[PDB]
């Protein structure tokens, strides 16, 4: 399918493009249409999806790349989510 569904621990459902989700090696292996993350919260998984669009947009770019912002409060949880997802 063109899109995939990632579900947070608190129930939120994020529909993202399949190619974008493949940015995560873990998700790329989990798919073998929906993926349920019992440990990643909505305020974390929304930033992960934002990183996917960011990565796909700028990875092969000759132009200047903007900073990926990360608020101090989400840094520790995002780090653990990123560590698990291999992002």
């Amino acid at each position: 399918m063109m899109y995939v569904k990632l579900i947070s621990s608190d129930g939120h459902e994020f529909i993202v493009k399949r190619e974008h989700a493949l940015t995560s090696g873990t998700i790329k292996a989990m798919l073998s249409n929906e993926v349920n993350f019992r440990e990643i919260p909505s305020h974390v998984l929304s930033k992960v999806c934002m990183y996917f669009t960011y990565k796909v947009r700028y990875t092969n770019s000759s132009t200047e790349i903007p900073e990926f912002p990360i608020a101090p409060e989400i840094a520790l949880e995002l780090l653990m989510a990123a560590n698990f997802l291999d992002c």
Partner: protein, 103 residues
């Protein structure tokens, strides 16, 4: 040229991109493919402001300086239950814990 969106309704949130010159109607089309709902049965908002299908996303206020990949713009979504369209409802995200004492 590309605008980055987060189409949101209930606890559902769609991450997609489109051109600044693309129309509100074409966005409803992308939603139809995903949530299986015809454009006529959906309403798209921008901070409680109903959007016209003939308008471009650019005209609606979605620009490269507002709909960035790292900070996508939010588009409200409302479906059609019976004769009346449901009220716009966007479930907020969870709140991060207290900032660690070491930070």
């Amino acid at each position: 040229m590309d605008v980055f969106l987060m189409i949101r309704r209930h606890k559902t949130t769609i991450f997609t991109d489109a051109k600044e010159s693309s129309t509100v109607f074409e966005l409803k089309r992308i939603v139809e493919g995903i949530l299986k709902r015809p454009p006529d049965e959906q309403r798209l908002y921008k901070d409680d402001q109903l959007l016209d299908d003939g308008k471009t996303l650019g005209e609606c206020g979605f620009t490269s300086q507002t709909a960035r990949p790292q900070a996508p713009a939010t588009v409200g979504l409302a479906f059609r239950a019976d004769d009346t369209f449901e009220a716009l409802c966007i479930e907020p995200f969870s709140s991060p814990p207290e900032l660690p004492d070491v930070m």
